[PDB]
Amino acid sequence: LGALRRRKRLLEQEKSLAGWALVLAGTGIGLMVLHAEMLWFGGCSWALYLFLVKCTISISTFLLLCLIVAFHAKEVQLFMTDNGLRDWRVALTGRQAAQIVLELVVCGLHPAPVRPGFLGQGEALLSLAMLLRLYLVPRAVLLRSGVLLNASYRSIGALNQVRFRHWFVAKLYMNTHPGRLLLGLTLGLWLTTAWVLSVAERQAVNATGHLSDTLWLIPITFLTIGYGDVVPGTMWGKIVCLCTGVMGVCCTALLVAVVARKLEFNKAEKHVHNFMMDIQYTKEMKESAARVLQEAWMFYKHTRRKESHAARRHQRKLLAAINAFRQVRLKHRKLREQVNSMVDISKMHMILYDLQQNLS
């Protein structure tokens, strides 16, 4: 069982090396947005601090580019354990080496220091390539959750062949908390996309494209209102305001199921509702059947007494009472049909319970 203690050792070490990579990538994005803002609000009076922040971004992307290699040097070392290999050259495939090189290129992009407030043409796309360092999130979310290492989860998942991955833990968090996730996701998209658009359209002279306009342009585009008071002007604005609209249609078609689930009855509450409406309708039928005799006996009374206008007054009420009685009874039978349609499944198990009495 030496290939089972070492597996938990390597998996804890990868959880640590997947936490620190996410910290050093969030630090890079957080020092990128600071550089892009103090170049705008500052100008050329703060060139020392611009150079200092650029060099700090270079350091905190070098340590990320080391920790990704330190994570794959644990994953190859885990794959050699799980299959009994000794020569590491057998384990390292071609597609995995291509994945490592692509993953190092994507976390390599940063506004490196080469040596009046707008960004450049190149250091505005390198700065907006830092946002592609968010493939590190589902890796750390999977490895920090215990489901990859907890023994009871793995045994029950092996009996049922479910293969714990990213789309399983996503459905776990989406079906245990649909509220926190869907609110703190849209309030994390309406600020990230509002910053990206307020990079894509800055106007120096009039101050007509910053966050005060994009935090209003993007919820309006997301909810498919589109007033037209503010409209994106560049071409990179027009790409982002189409991506936001597509995500808005998709999240509407997502919310249309979550709201559809909640307003329906619980299965145990609908039976209480039906069982109370049944004894309300029985009471209304017993009222109406007394109304019918209350009018018919007065009609026979004034028929014998030959009060003719009283007979023509009560025969009309007799016909109206019969008309009410039919409507109450046809509500009652529709509800009894709803009852007989829903408890068919329990009727199946009840008839099988009455068939259980056939052994002796």
């Binding site: 039928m285 017993k286 109406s288 007394a290 018919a296 006996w297 026979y300 028929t303 019969i322 009685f325």
Partner: protein
């Protein structure tokens, strides 16, 4: 007959949704086949009671002139006979085919508008034509249709 020819010509296909064998009459089995193909599950007693409401000769089966009397009621809007026949069953909780004095004096007093228990003694004395002490079904419809 008083009925015209094309109406008989169109009631014949309505009769031959039940009379599938073309025997000239309807039994409980041919009725139950249609009742189950419409999606509801009767019992044998319920099917036999549906037959016995319109069986005039008393043969246990329904032929076409008995079918015409059944379709003379289910063609109009408010079948005034069934809405009295089941208002008779709302009272008769014991199912004995009778309304006793206690059943009537229970229902008509507490439910309605404050009707006295002295009027029920006059009503039951007027209703019992045969003097059977209690209200039948035959006198109950003759009170409604007076």
């Amino acid at each position: 007959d008083q009925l015209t020819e094309e109406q008989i010509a169109e009631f014949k296909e309505a009769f031959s949704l039940f009379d599938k064998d073309g025997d000239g009459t309807i039994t409980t089995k041919e009725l139950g086949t249609v009742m189950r193909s419409l999606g509801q599950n009767p019992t044998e007693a319920e099917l036999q009671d549906m037959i016995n409401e319109v069986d005039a000769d008393g043969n246990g089966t329904i032929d076409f002139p008995e079918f015409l009397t059944m379709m003379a009621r289910k063609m109009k809007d408010t079948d005034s006979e069934e809405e009295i026949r089941e208002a008779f069953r709302v009272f008769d909780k014991d199912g004995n085919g009778y309304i006793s004095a206690a059943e009537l004096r229970h229902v008509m007093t507490n439910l309605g508008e404050k009707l006295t228990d002295e009027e029920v003694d006059e009503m039951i004395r007027e209703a019992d034509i045969d003097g059977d002490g209690q209200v039948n079904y035959e006198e109950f419809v003759q009170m409604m249709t007076a």
